[PDB]
Design a protein around this ligand. Structure first.
Ligand SMILES: O=c1ccn([C@H]2C[C@H](O)[C@@H](COP(=O)(O)NP(=O)(O)OP(=O)(O)O)O2)c(=O)[nH]1
Ligand SMILES: O=c1ccn([C@H]2C[C@H](O)[C@@H](COP(=O)(O)NP(=O)(O)OP(=O)(O)O)O2)c(=O)[nH]1
Ligand SMILES: O=c1ccn([C@H]2C[C@H](O)[C@@H](COP(=O)(O)NP(=O)(O)OP(=O)(O)O)O2)c(=O)[nH]1
Ligand SMILES: [Mg+2]
Ligand SMILES: [Mg+2]
Ligand SMILES: [Mg+2]
Lengths: 140, 140, 140
């Protein structure tokens, strides 16, 4: 399923020195986000740092949201994941997309400018209206 | 997209002293869940505690599920996330919604009664039936 | 919503000694994945290990993806979660499904052959095409 989404470039390196996010294949679920940084950031074991993307999106349709996730190789092999675990992007959010990078592992890690550091999917979402009722119709 | 969802209030403070979950805007993807507690819970670095919501939902439609996620500010700034990372709520689950709160950071944190401590989205889900086949048609 | 999905068994114990993933009920959102191991793996506090499933899927439809998540009991009570937090499976991925198991807690844990160790949902996904614009129309 395809959707055109408005994007505003906030840093002039985005789309040039720091490529715009892209799907690798026609069958890819997510697209990689790149770190928009002036210099490398050394991230010690256990620490968190806020990484800018240099861009803003406006999903606009309230039936859609985005989720930011770790990349599997970074997470598994290096312990480089998200400090908020999963990032939820609202349809009406127009600010810069930010990435909370958390080193959950035991080795220091260098986050490099332009590096694909996380990924993002767009999923349909449903807004619930609660209907209060008295009765309906936690090894493993 | 909108859906009416049955909710049963299990604690009489929910909808009163502890507001029912609500979307902040018409464009919000998720709604915040509040801690249904009698007193504050001090959560030491590295520990996990089970927080009640005081409510039960019945999604009922097997084409829908919910996912509980950390709130980004709590996760990034305070290390307050979910012990199970992401909570998956089944359409036929009618028990109390529970929140596994994990302090992944280095500072103690007070979980307060009524505090918005996590969030939840409703997403369409597909149930797979596996079709066994011999052949089809893991820095970063 | 239902979808037939092609699966290739890579280990002859899968579907025999190690049951194929199944939904517990007609209302379940996710299905449990079992560890395809020759012997138990002891996973020390803080460590990560790669667990095979002994199977490959081909979702094939680019409007669908899968997400691997921790099981809530394992995550909350034992700290057994995913090293990449959430696993994203692309529609065109035809390799073995692998599970990055991370012990985030304080006690050693034995991963047993055949054990339900994680779960997986199938969700609709949307592929974005970015439309560059000058202007559109981060306690808690
Ligand atoms: O990883 C993230 C998560 C969120 N965000 C942005 C987009 C989202 O729409 C917005 C709010 O997300 P949350 O509701 O998860 N954060 P929080 O509840 O702390 O902030 P707010 O009070 O604005 O709702 O922050 C990011 O840029 N990166
Ligand atoms: O964060 C959560 C996750 C799940 N739940 C509830 C709702 C869900 O439908 C139910 C089962 O979720 P999981 O399958 O993730 N947990 P587990 O596999 O350990 O329990 P079960 O044996 O019941 O499937 O637990 C919560 O209340 N909070
Ligand atoms: O938990 C996971 C996550 C991914 N995978 C597989 C399926 C997925 O389609 C593929 C790629 O996932 P990511 O894009 O999250 N990993 P990474 O970006 O490190 O690898 P690649 O360069 O192949 O995109 O790895 C797993 O088997 N288990
Ligand atoms: Mg990738
Ligand atoms: Mg919020
Ligand atoms: Mg379960």
């Amino acid at each position: 399923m395809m959707k055109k989404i408005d994007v505003k470039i906030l840093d002039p390196r985005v789309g040039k020195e720091f490529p715009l996010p892209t799907y690798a294949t026609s069958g890819s679920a997510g697209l990689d986000l790149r770190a928009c940084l002036n210099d490398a950031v050394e991230l010690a074991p256990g620490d968190t740092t806020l990484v800018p993307t240099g861009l803003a999106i406006h999903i606009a349709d309230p039936s859609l949201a985005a989720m930011m996730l770790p990349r599997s190789g970074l997470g598994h092999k290096h312990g480089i994941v998200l400090g908020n675990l999963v990032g939820l992007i609202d349809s009406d959010y127009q600010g810069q997309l930010m990435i909370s990078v958390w080193n959950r592992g035991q080795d220091s890690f260098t986050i490099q400018p332009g590096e694909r550091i996380a990924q993002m999917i767009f999923v349909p979402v449903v807004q619930a209206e609660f209907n209060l009722v008295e009765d309906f119709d936690f090894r493993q």
